[model samples]
Target chain A: SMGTVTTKDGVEIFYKDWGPRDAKVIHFHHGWPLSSDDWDAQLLFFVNKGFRVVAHDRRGHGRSSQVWDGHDMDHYADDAAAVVEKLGTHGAMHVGHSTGGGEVVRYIARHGERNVSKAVLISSVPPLMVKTSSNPNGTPKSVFDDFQAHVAANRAQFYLDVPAGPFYGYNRPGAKPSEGVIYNWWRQGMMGSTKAQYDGIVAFSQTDFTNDLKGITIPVLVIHGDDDQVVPYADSGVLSAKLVKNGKLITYKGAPHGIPTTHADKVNADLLEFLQS
Target chain B: SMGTVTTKDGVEIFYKDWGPRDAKVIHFHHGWPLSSDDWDAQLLFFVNKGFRVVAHDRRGHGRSSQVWDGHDMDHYADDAAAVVEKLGTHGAMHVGHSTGGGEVVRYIARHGERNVSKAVLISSVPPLMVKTSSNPNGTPKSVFDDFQAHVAANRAQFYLDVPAGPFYGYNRPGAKPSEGVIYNWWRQGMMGSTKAQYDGIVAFSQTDFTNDLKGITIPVLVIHGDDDQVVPYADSGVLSAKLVKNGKLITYKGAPHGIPTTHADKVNADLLEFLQS
Candidate 1:
């Protein structure tokens, strides 16, 4: 059944829950331009593993209310916390990808140890998203502005382009692209309001995660693909693990940004091992 | 007068010479899809500083005759060596940006120490461009493939997009687009044949720079914008500096990929100091 949580702003956030309702919870936050549907593989696998798996569609995305207000990283973390507060019976293992990964770190930082058991950041943007004087290793603001312009001007075309190209890693030579996957990505993207997705570009690109990462006291597992085109591993994931107090890193040699979708078997196996340990 | 150097493949490469023809030489290499014109600011500045500045257009770039063959990195390095040989000079300082940066490293490695003095790589991709088992920190092949596809499908649009946007840092919130700069970038891109520019994408993205960087015995200086959008500093420049035996890193706080063009004064001043030392 579909799940809903009421945010402090009274916005109704939508989510999905599977597995034993009373089992230890695993709350998943998905990347930008995606919905709770992005975690299909993880949700199904973890549910069968005797863990309660849950995921929320960010505000203005998927089945959630398409609110015109509150679309940045802070709001993203807040909305995610609201879902956990309402649905999670026990402290949960948190997982996120790309922007979702940023969301997890901020959530853990804001809620402290009481809200989370463990965390996994996959291809996450942390420490800061925008190129700044302090983060002399970030993408320039121009890059983010271009992304915003692209998303705002032609989101549908941009959505189709990324998944069919960099996002899915299907654009490589000798790689056979799955049309079904591209369509699914487009479907997920189209479900969200354009405003939220547009603002999300700034949230993912400008927000620094160094403070959030430093604030996390719980154990963290960082997973990233070396071949990820969307978020180069060194800037997004590897450095993130280095920043966390008790973070572990797992690298995939040729995996893309959508590793969980393209390399599901391997990702599922790794997650299971990490959870067990 | 302009300069011409013949490659091993018999292709004539074009170049520009500034300052005293007999002064200590410093050769500059430009990035992909653009010509030696990209280094105008650097050339003029250094020439005024009493150093002979020599810059060559790659086989398929600038005023060089568009040959039907030899458009990869090996050819690029060999052509550069050909230019240095024709100039009857050895052990000159070499500075390169983006693809040109990779070319400088490869040329130094391929031709050995007799051909170079100090070297500087700015926003360069080295050690390798694509992520593989051996290079688990590089960008994926898919990213390169996507770039190739974009160039193949929409060469003009892509060229304009990059320079007018991310490459020149003109997409920043307060950045004012320079019509003249955009026109110059487009003009340089159009000077080369589609074949040369198209194949260049591969040379810049796939050429492994690990061996090239490791083989160098001379002091190398690496400069990169922490906020570079085209090439993330953490993944490319920072890592390259770490691998070189005597490499020094100078990070620009908010510089973009075209820092040599956009922030020429600062870059030239810093390079002069580094070279003198």
Candidate 2:
């Protein structure tokens, strides 16, 4: 269940490995402000589908180390590589959501044809994050600054509000609030130190994975929600799909930023199809 | 300039009307984590084209009164009606983005034929957000919960992070930062209160506009980005386009959630064409 791998930084990264050990692997990397718990649905479904599902809490998220430093995409990808190295992964599918989605591309790009079989970016931030003339479609730096300010000012309240309301769709007009869901989100956040989550806001928001995505020669699947209030589909998933050498796009209508959790069945099924293909 | 219209709760809703007041009106509604500034490009473009452009920051957004109550979609639609009544908007084009898109549909549905001319849902949320037996395509409650948690825990940080990173597609690898864009996002967020922005997380994610979209008798233009990192095109815009009786879908090949900002020139041109037709 619980495992640890030492990163190049000598930091011990924690992970959850499920399914038959001998089965082909499908590694799930979670988004920012979350840990392996975000991969619950994918792990459950993929493991049940007869594949080894491996996921790790980025150093500061979930069950991983609550270190104050190294919370950017580089660390995220390297941490993933460390896990794969320790697990002796030969060829595995890397599935990630939000920040994890960006990390998947970074991992493959950094490691290149080593252990990665294919990649799937679910509601990920990639190619770039800062807006400019060359990359006119990027979000500006002020936005990231605001994020830092918010976290620095009111981390606890913001964390609870995001999951219970927008991330889970409980904020929907008639949605019945489920305390269980909120508790899980809080539990996930509580597992990590504020430092990791705080820096992670930057990692998920500012890191550009364009080269990572373009360097990915392996078949890639990009999935996103049309109404994603967090990571809009137009700029992230769909464009990433176009950047990949063999990328395919599958969109979910009216789905929010949390499509993986909300529409796990379709997301998982799509991953399965992509993996199988 | 600034204007106010009283809601059912006697809440004075605020709005901006530009161009000739006598021209066929076009009402613009913005999405969550953003204010009327989201429609700045459209307002300028449409207004210059000789159409009277009207946009109101949702009750909890922009310069509008950030009341604790009336944060849900029903209230949102009613608030919109308040603007319509004050503006004396009859047979006006209604265009909304993300949650604003959903609001447009609900407004037309709730108010019937008298208030709107045609409708456009751009990267909007609708139908349903939670995935259930009936709506397998919807996102899970946990995802929204995660978002709610994020916003609640780190609103300022999350808001800036979204616009600077995902909304404008700046988090990609090699993306250059743009100060102007980031400042605009900050300006918009700062214009609204924490309560409205916080409550908006629920309003945008939870409100289902499927029935509203179905009930629309006027021509609807569904504009979306195939690569939107925030709102996925397939689930929200594409599906809504299919459901609407006269919905026309204009998909940007590589546009982000902030397509109106990123691809304004093209989008404006397309809107002009759609309007003429």
Candidate 3:
């Protein structure tokens, strides 16, 4: 399962595809500044349920080669397509959380049709993030700029602070923060390249996904945490759900952007239900 | 992170100790027919919290030297004690899953009080497991007989059936079974000697921890799944709680024997809460 597929541009992407190759597929795309390790929960969950589960490390992340260039949204989709094509999979279930959600959105639109039977986006960033007249309700560009600045200055501290604060709502009053959870997020982020993570701020926020969501025809499940501080649910999950043809919406009340880790079971059961339905 | 420690008897034990040494420690014990690898879920959970987390393969299993003899409860405890002492750990939090639960009990009873400040048993076989006039509800001997017989006949097939079926409750309808988990479990079980695994059935199922539990004065948490198929909670977990000093029992409703893997995040969060409390 610990193997790599090379993109057309000579970038190597690592992936783990466990369970029976002939079984039904569940493909996971992970969040930014994290690798396939982020999807360990979902991968083990869906794979144990008798499905072939697959996840990959993006270029410049995890065990994949640390390339400085081609770290854009379009290139992200192309890298995913290379992996999918190498695996020769179809009629699979697709799932993405946070930045991974946008990756799946773009993948479905750019990749071949009939590749997925159903799709799930958890605490995803889509439609658009930075506020502009075109999408006036989006978050401010200054917010993303601040992220890059922090990455350039001290990405280590920035990674720890994000999870300890808004990413998992640990900063919320009366909230029970988990030191392990915050540290886990930091560990994943530290494994990634500063250049990739720095460029990723623009990749996730500035890259509008309105057309990506509109182009997908497969059954889509949109899940948002109303209390998310990273990607506010208002301009992202809600707007993205409305863009897709068969997109269904599910929200975890009072959940943070890291809902997949904090409220993993809730997401697992809900994803199972959505996939089954 | 993977290291080896040799017991006084020359039996080599495999272990993984991660995170900072000065950090609070969380030492883990794995179940029967498995290795330290089985605790990968909880180790990742605790280590991320910045705790010095450690897990070990029992003698005659995993990377540890496999022997045809001395596969009893005393030998198991001695092997673990050797490793813990070699590492010079004290005031560490102890957690054991299934057979590992029993291992913790023995370790605490035989080792000095400095090793552990708190102990947790997850679906452990404690107090007793052989049915007699004193322990009326313990599992029948023939059941263990069937296990040994199967192990001798075909451990390969036997291992596959477990995680695929009752071990994780994968046989139940609507269950989300992970083929990777099942295969991983099988891989671990296959790495050890048949003699040790065969003897382990008796060691886990028949060895009583009555005095072992009663001796523990430190804060202890006893967790068990309500629907455990391997070690019935009523006979093990319920009885273990009554025996241990300062013991508290937490039940996972509708959970199976392998709750740590199947219901990892839930158990991880609950464990962190208990440790903090």
Candidate 4:
């Protein structure tokens, strides 16, 4: 069945719901230019642990409506709110990776508490990615601009380049390349609107999530890899952990940004430990 | 490039080799009418444990040559032997599920231990399946015939029915079914050649692995669920465990036949424990 929920802005979000509704819920938010399918590893891991797992395709991604506008962080968070509200979810454990991290930050900040109890950010990009006088450790705007340029020019090639390179640390020395993982990433990336992806670069990178993180009062778990090839851990994961009220940070010694795929065993276990604790 | 090795009889076998080749090797074999994709959970779990994980899609199944001929246990075992030998695999541990369990038993018997050391069978069909006059406790021939008939009739529907019903224990009371898993099962089933899948029914059911199990001198572990709906546990798993020289049996309390997928955490950890022991 095609299960789609509509946001106030009339955007349709597609979702996969596993486990019993009454069971403790874990809502998963995905990264830039990808769908909830990115959470497949986490979903299967947690669901088997007797937890209700939920994942949604953000607007303009996956099987959801490929809208041109509303590609910013606000819409992403609000769209998530619409899904949680529509599903009548409660006491949820919110988790986000990469751009989804910013989305979770905003969702909990703007829509405080609600059905969510705890939150997690992994390899997240928040507290701004555009290097500025205030945040000098951030990545330069040109890097994000490169993303926009490549996605607009030839998304197919750019998508393939990402997973095969920095996104998954596949370019690392002695790295075991997964043709399937790379292609799956490319496939998910290509499913969304080029306009949404182009705008998403700004949404994910320059959003300035300092105020958003400060608003979250619930227990938050921040996770990142010191060797993350995508978002620099010190700026995003490390700094944002200090921004939240009850936020706790856990770092993977030599893991890449895509720990969910690259070091799934460690990442999944850490998450389970956090959830249980 | 697609990693493939041609068997002696010219049958091409496709395999995925992940992690350090010289490290502890864990070879995974999937069930009948399924492919190496079936071992995604186990492979990912073991590979991250610093073990070299290897999985090959059985011939006539996935990305392998669809040979209409030689669709029996002998060919199945020999094809696996060909892959292990071609890879120059040494000191390897083999894990198989369902029909794969039978394949491993025969492979060890026909090929001898060689570079292999330990083995595990999960929800496997071993000592017997089809009940002949000699082994009346086994399932009837009509049951397997219905599977072939279903395969020939409508594979899409047949596959969906399996994971949703007996295969995953989804039909159990209060069971929270996974639509993604059900659809994934159907997807993998559809990828195989119809002819190959049809004959695979015979290769799995009619193949008596009693003699093969008796031949294995290496440590073998047999795991099954008492509530297994597909392959009854008493006749297959118990009998095979007893046949092997140093076999150990572990049964999950009220678990389904598809424990590898349905109860991935328990199975993966149990496997890791067994491997370490």
Native contacts recovered, each model: 0.00, 0.00, 0.00, 0.00
- Over B155-274, each residue of candidate 2 has an lDDT whose tens digit, in order, gives 435555677788878987776768788767765774454555655776777776777777776888888888787766777888898887777888888778877788889878877776
Q: Alpha-carbon interface RMSD of model 4?
A: 18.7
> lDDT of each structure?
0.81, 0.76, 0.83, 0.83
lDDT of 4 by residue, B1-277 (tens): 2247899999888776766656888899999788876776666566556678778889899768988889998898899988888788867889999989888888888888866789999989888899899988779999999999998998888988998899888999979776556755776678788999999999899988887788788898999999999889999888888999999999898899888877778888888898889
Positional deviation of residue B190's Cα in model 4 after best superposition, in angstroms: 0.6
Candidate 3 residue lDDT tens string, B49-141? 888888999876877765445777888888888877888886788899999999999888888556788999999989788787788878788
**C-alpha TM-score for every candidate:** 0.50, 0.50, 0.55, 0.55
Query: Poorest 10 consecutive residues of model 4 chain B by lDDT?
Result: B40-49
Per-residue alpha-carbon lDDT of candidate 4 for residues A179-268, written as tens digits (9 for 90 to 100): 889878866875554556777888998899898888788888999999997899888888888988888999898888888888888878
> What's the distance in Å from true for residue A47, model 1?
1.2
What's model 1's lDDT at A12? 73
Q: Which candidate, 2 or 3, would have the higher lDDT against the true structure?
A: 3
- Backbone clash count, each prediction separately: 9, 101, 8, 0
Residue-wise lDDT of candidate 1 within A150-183, one digit each (tens)? Answer: 6644454577788999997889998889988987
Ranking by lDDT: 4, 3, 1, 2
- Ordered list by TM-score, greatest first: 4, 3, 1, 2
* Residue B271, model 4: Cα distance from true site in angstroms: 1.3
The value of fnat for model 3 is 0.00
After best superposition, candidate 3 residue A88: deviation in angstroms? 1.9
Report the lDDT of model 1 for residue A111: 69
